[PDB]
């Protein structure tokens, strides 16, 4: 069970860190509208 828990915490924190650092990687400039 602990092998499953370590695996899920690698998996979930992989996708949560994709979420967080994705919006830190200049999301508001990824618009088609120019200023």
Partner 1 sequence: LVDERMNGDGTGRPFGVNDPVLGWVLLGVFGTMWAIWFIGQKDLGDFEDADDGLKL
Ligand X SMILES: CCCCCCCCCCCCCCCCCC(=O)OC[C@H](CO[C@@H]1O[C@H](CO)[C@H](O)[C@H](O)[C@H]1O)OC(=O)CCCCCCCCCCCCCCCCC
Instruction: Kindly state whether residue 34 participates in binding partner 1, applying the rule CB under 8 A.
Output: no
Residue 28 phi, psi (nearest 5):
-65, -15
Applying CB under 6 A, does 17 fall inside the site for ligand X? no
CB of 32 to partner 1, least distance (A): 13
Q: Which of the listed partners (ligand X, partner 1, none) does 19 bind, with a CB threshold of 5 to 8 Å by partner kind?
A: ligand X
Report d(CA 6, CA 9) in Å as an integer: 5
Residues in the chain: 35
Residues that bind ligand X (CB under 6 A): 12, 16, 19-20
């Amino acid at each position: 069970m602990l092998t499953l828990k370590i695996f899920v915490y690698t998996v979930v924190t992989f996708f949560v860190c994709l979420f967080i650092f994705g919006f830190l990687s200049n999301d508001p400039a990824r618009n088609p509208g120019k200023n």
